[PDB]
């Protein structure tokens, strides 16, 4: 069952083993139960840690209900996949990914004062192809000022660094003007909407670009796995797959009392049930009660 | 889908588009009788004007029924399509059973015949291993968990290089 | 037996969700 804090995340999500648990919880509440006390505790590190480890339990089955658009004609199945992942991030408690990684940027370098360590401490979160170019243009403005560039904003060296890194950003191909005018806003709602109708266009191009990069990586990895697999004779393939399946089955059956092991074994029995149900009536598929 | 929809018996489709099934409706004042004719089947119903808005009160919410996962089914679909692409070029192999007669055996250099019979055994090996379709269910499970860990990011599942680059421009070019 | 249910069949089967639940159950009381 659930422990009164996992069930507060599973309300808006639509994955099956969360929806059936929420439905059994409401079956408990309608049939004469009181709601347990929500904890007014757990100081901020434990709060964001349990957010990190509780949104994981609602995102990780959400990826498996999302089918990859591997090798399809048109960029619109990539838009389907990225929209599904956006909806999964929305139902997982994450924000828009732009403002989410902006929040991570602010969280990472709250204690950085110069601009070289703001490019050092956010090395894991930005592209190294872009981090190398930003470090080299910062070494250029460092050769200009002959002083460490300060990460304050009102410094003239940082102003020249901003006017050079905007050219670096257009050199990467992404327009910094529509993005800065989006997050800086305008007076009237009409010239804010005219900026948003460019920023959302770039935003769609950006998320479909990295989603298409992801499905191209899975396409090439599946092609490499198949081409390393087709070079084997069939008895070696059957022995390797049966031995790997038996070993990872022994790894589950060894864990006695573990909940994940019991769920693993029940899903194995459900897979065998699916094989039996397609074996009984293969004209229509599995037997589903309706 | 939203809970309130706004469609039905207004800008509705008026007729058929295929030769497999026929349909024509009755656009009367208050009511509507459909007449759908499909070969050996015949159906003519009488529906009301508000009988189409009560249709979308309950939602269907169609869902997949997958053996392992919908993601695993998509990866197994791509492995089946790649096995189709390899099977299309094991289908253009030249027929070598026509050169098994003994009038090709004894006119041949012996090592060339050794090479030819070993090439035939190699083709039978390649064809037995490209049509092992039971093994795609365990080939797909080696692509799954690294992908599922990549989508289990600490910032956002749909995150990528370009959106992080754009937000780094937004973080850097503003006043700290 | 056969023809079990619909939401019992909609479950993404070999997703983790429980190993993460195991580590989140044995981590948070050990860190509070």
């Amino acid at each position: 069952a659930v422990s009164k804090k996992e069930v507060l995340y599973f309300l808006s999500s639509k994955d099956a083993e969360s929806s059936t648990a929420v439905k059994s919880y409401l079956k408990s509440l309608y049939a004469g139960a009181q709601v347990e006390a929500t904890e007014t505790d757990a100081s901020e590190l434990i709060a964001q840690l349990e957010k990190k480890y509780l949104s994981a339990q609602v995102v990780e089955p959400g990826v498996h209900n999302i089918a990859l658009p591997l090798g399809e004609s048109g960029s619109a199945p990539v838009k389907r996949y990225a929209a599904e992942l956006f909806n999964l991030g929305a139902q997982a408690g994450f924000e828009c990914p732009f403002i989410e990684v902006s929040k991570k940027f602010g969280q990472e370098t709250a204690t950085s004062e110069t601009v070289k360590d703001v490019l050092n401490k956010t090395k894991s979160y930005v592209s190294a192809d872009y981090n190398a170019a930003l470090n080299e243009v910062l070494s250029s403005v460092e050769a200009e000022i002959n002083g460490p560039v300060l990460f304050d904003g009102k410094t003239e060296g940082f102003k020249k660094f901003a006017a050079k890194a905007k050219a670096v950003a257009v050199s990467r191909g992404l327009p910094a003007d529509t993005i800065l005018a989006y997050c800086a806003g305008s007076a009237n709602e009409d010239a804010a909407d005219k900026v948003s109708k460019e920023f959302f266009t770039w935003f769609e191009s950006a998320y479909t670009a990295d989603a298409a990069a992801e499905v191209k990586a899975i396409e090439a990895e599946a092609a490499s796995i198949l081409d390393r697999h087709l070079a084997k004779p069939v008895a070696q393939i059957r022995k390797e797959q049966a031995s790997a399946y038996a070993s990872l089955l022994k790894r589950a059956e060894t864990a006695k009392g573990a909940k994940w092991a019991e769920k693993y074994l029940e899903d194995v029995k459900a897979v065998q049930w699916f094989d039996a149900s397609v074996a009984e009536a293969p004209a229509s598929g599995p037997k589903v009660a309706a | 889908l939203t809970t309130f929809t706004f469609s039905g018996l207004q800008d509705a489709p008026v007729a058929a588009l295929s030769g497999s099934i026929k349909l024509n409706v009755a656009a009367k004042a208050g009511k509507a009788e459909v007449t759908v004719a499909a070969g050996a089947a015949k159906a003519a119903t009488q529906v009301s004007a508000a009988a189409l808005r009560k249709l979308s009160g309950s939602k269907i919410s169609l869902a997949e029924v997958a053996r392992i996962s919908v993601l695993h089914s998509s990866i197994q679909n791509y492995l089946l399509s790649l096995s189709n692409e390899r099977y299309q070029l094991l289908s253009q192999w030249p027929d070598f059973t026509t050169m098994y007669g003994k009038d090709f055996y004894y006119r041949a250099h012996p090592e060339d015949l050794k090479k030819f019979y070993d090439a035939a055994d190699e083709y039978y090996k390649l064809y037995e291993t490209v049509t092992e379709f039971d093994s795609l269910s365990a080939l797909a499970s080696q692509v799954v968990p690294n992908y599922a860990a990549r989508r289990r990011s600490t910032v956002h599942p749909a995150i990528g290089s370009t959106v992080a680059d754009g937000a780094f421009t937004n973080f850097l070019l503003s006043k700290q | 037996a056969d023809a079990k249910a619909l939401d019992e069949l909609r479950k993404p089967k070999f997703s983790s969700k429980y190993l993460i639940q195991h580590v989140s159950q044995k981590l948070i009381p050990a860190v509070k």
Binding site: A56, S124, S127, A128, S224, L248 | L89, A149, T154, V155 | -
Partner: peptide
Amino acid sequence: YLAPLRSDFTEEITAPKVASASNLVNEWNN
């Protein structure tokens, strides 16, 4: 068909490492 279960996070946002194209089509045409 069953995969090993992992519970770990990726904090890095990198390119997804598009792997090498293997030479099976050219070997089979050869």
